[PDB]
Amino acid sequence: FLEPFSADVWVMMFVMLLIVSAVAVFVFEYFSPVFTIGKAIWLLWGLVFNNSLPVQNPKGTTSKIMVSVWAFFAVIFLASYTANLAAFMIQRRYVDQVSGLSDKKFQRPNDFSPAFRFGTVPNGSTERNIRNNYLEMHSYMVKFNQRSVQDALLSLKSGKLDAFIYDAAVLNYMAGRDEGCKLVTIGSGKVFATTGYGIAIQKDSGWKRQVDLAILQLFGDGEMEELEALWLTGICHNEKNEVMSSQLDIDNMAGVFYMLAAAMALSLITFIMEHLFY
Amino acid sequence: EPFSASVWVMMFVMLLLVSAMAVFIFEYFSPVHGPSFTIGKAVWLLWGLVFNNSLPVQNPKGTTSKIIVSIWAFFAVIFLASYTANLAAFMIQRRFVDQVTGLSDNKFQRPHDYSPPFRFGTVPQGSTERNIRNNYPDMHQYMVKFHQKGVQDALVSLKTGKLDAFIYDAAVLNYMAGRDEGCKLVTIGSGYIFATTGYGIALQKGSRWKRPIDLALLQFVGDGEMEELEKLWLTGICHTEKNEVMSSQLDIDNMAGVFYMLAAAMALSLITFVWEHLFYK
């Protein structure tokens, strides 16, 4: 309801009241020789948002009816507002909390009061690289190091560990071949230290170029795609996940509640101000 | 209706709860103008509050009623929420699928009787013409009257409404759905053709390259390629997931159904008029 709330809807509501206020005073005064107050403001309020307003109803024929029309359209808008929020409820990106290690949350667990946890397999190119670039991460993660990928998986899967770090191809296949689809690749699984598997040879004397040729013939033939589908291909293809009926969470409405409290305080000191006017 | 097995009775039961609430309330109201009309208002007043408010009603005073009412109001609210959820479920139920019985349907069997003008047809010199003539000769003659020749003739006719509907080899028609621009054409019901056959190849009666040919063919069936050829040529756009539809015209006949219930109520009120009309001395 943010766009509508932001423009025209409020101004229009003031005008209907104001038109009615002019007509009501003139007409009402027309009806009775012997008034638009806050009550009129409440009426904009009563007609506009699902009733529940007990203060008043204007004693006139033209405006009151016009507003009943307004109210009916306004109800449609209310209904749509519900639908608008339903649209939110239709889907949600339940991926808000994530760390890519460029954030420094991983850099220190201690900054976060609960202890965080992440680990990797030792004697790896990953661990050596880590020790080379980031010392603190290595020295901290030695406690979270795991025996084997199935066992590392045991630390992630059964709880007692939050995040696991490993080779991207294995982690992507693992995501696809996941017993529980809940495990998901970090972000887009776009990996830092972008690398690829390599084939050894002795030294400058070897198969060299002829051997490489074969490799790029494989790409041309298109065999690798087939082999990928057979060996590499992954269960529960990584589409944006959809969450249904997720426990209610409030943070912006909390803000709204604070808006309320503040607005109150203002009106209270306004009353004080007014009092002083005297 | 689901609420009705348990919910409708409970609504009647809900009215019974109201009587007890009024009984607590009557004593409070009169330890010992004409508020006694309030219990009636509650049956009506309580009922209004039950459905989306919208009742001027009467203002109950008894202290207990406010609590009791708030308890009912809570219920009414979650009822409405429950009702909304049921409606929400219906949005799923609001999937529009073609309503027809195909060849079996009377629209095909006895076309003349319907006031509206519609016609079914098929391609000339087809194997089916004979089936039609060996099913309904008259239908075949009707098809002959409205003859077309190319797929696109039929297609356009269907897209323009020049042709009511069109029968052909389903396999091809499925392929047509496999290639529609805009996805406006569908098969009958599930799509069972109701004529069952598969493609065949000619051989000189004397010739038998086929018995030898057969062996090669089966493994080909077994082989993944048939499905590759399927994916190669038979793949079709807009795979038929139980289709879902929405309407800007809403429903006027469902609305009429609602209005019939409404009309019944009107009749009932006329009956109560009659009761007063002929009120006993």
Add this chain to the structure above:
Amino acid sequence: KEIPRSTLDSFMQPFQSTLWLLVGLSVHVVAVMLYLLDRFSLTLSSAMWFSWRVLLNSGLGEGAPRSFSARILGMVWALFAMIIVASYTANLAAFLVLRRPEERITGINDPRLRNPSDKFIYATVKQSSVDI
């Protein structure tokens, strides 16, 4: 066949109960705040009824605000109450989110075909065309 789903009261615990406890408490504080100034220059029960009028949506209307400042207060708080119930209509909306995605198994794409899971046994009929 797949397993079933829980009842609405059970459903309420995930979102409705905590909010109801926190918010219900919040209404009383709001009612107290308006009176503060009013007190300075069963009233509490009446205020609660006015604030509850929004929640149940009973709108009993037993009592009305004492002062224009309270009305601004009412203008503030009444609008907030309306928002709170509209958010309850969002909760209303949430009840219909119970539909189950479920699971299906591909002939070749699925993991089971990929491996006869030790835990997941599958089979066919002996000496049949499927066996062949």
Add this chain to the structure above:
Amino acid sequence: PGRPTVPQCCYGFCVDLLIKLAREMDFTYEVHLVADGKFGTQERVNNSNAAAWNGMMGELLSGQADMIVAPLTINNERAQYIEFSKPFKYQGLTILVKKEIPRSTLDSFMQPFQSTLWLLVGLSVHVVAVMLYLLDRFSTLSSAMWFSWRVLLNSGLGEGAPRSFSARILGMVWALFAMIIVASYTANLAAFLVLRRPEERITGINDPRLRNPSDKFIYATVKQSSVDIYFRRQVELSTMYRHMEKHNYESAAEAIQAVRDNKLHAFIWDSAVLEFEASQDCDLVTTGELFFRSGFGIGMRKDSPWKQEVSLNILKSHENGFMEELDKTWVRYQECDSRSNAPATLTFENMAGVFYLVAGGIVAGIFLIFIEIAYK
């Protein structure tokens, strides 16, 4: 329009990389862009009918440019002729094109409008007043009609139900159905929200429409683009090879434009150049799964005693996150909104109409008060 060599200023990711090397590397650099529009591919030389790939690469074989710094995909056909460094990026071909989605401003209320009955039944709500009068018999019109309007709108005006209890039963019925209708509408309003009218043609590899090309598939690539090798070698794609060829472009600016201009329904190219543009304009969309993956590498004449070092240097660039930092550094600056649904102040105009009607209303109001005056 006439093209001749021109002194120009060029700045780039590859330039920053090149200078990074130049600090790391002793060699000094002077750069000039290749005259040939395309990087170039080995092709028949007209009457000669046999020729070097030319363009950027042939100049390289030719020695015009000793080393080639550009975002060039690395492939075997080229690879035999020249040495290539380790590849910096791994971009995959996707098809960069889209159609603005069709959504409705007038659709939600319309559910009533078109139903027609929505209005007619409102009038019949008014008619119920006549039935009530009948109820009155053998036991105000303005108030009744207004009362009927209220049930549609929950007016709660004052007087309430007819004296006959039986008559009042219809009030419950009509308001019942009114309520139902509103709710039903809301559900159908949500039916609009359900949407899914759009159909995705993105899976190109498994796609049916792309494979069997037609005049509805005006499809291209860049004249002399590496994918043409794929179409060339893929006799399986010969059909498509030509279908594609007949529509090819000298450059991406024209190729993207055709889809933007809507001259061509679809465009086929690789990811590194295309996705950035996808962010840049975004009306257009990429679809399906990247096919024929490749990693970018520098092209140089054979035996370059530096390629190896270069490979080590770019390797380090990956190792130290430099390569990575640069890619985030430029690409990151461009973003595309995730699929989501927002109202966008469209359907609000009917209410604009309502407010216009208010004005008409109060104008009519002077004649309505004339009526009281008239009965003077």
Add this chain to the structure above:
Amino acid sequence: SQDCDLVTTGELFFRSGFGIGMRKDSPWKQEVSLNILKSHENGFMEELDKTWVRYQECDSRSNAPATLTFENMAGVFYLVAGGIVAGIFLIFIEIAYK
């Protein structure tokens, strides 16, 4: 379609068709097929499949309202009745106090 506790996986693979079987030199082979073809075209085959197969079907019965979900509502109903009784004596005491 007969046992609602069992369901099929959606994919259909290895498309195949059943048939009658005879030795290659059977004198009834020419006759056996012509008969099968005639039964397909005539509709006899549809009568048999429809007659036997049509007996049973599974549908998504029940919708989602009340029922099991409503059982806890019973609990809710139990909760309304319990609250009022305490208020009686307590309310009377309050009245006595003031």
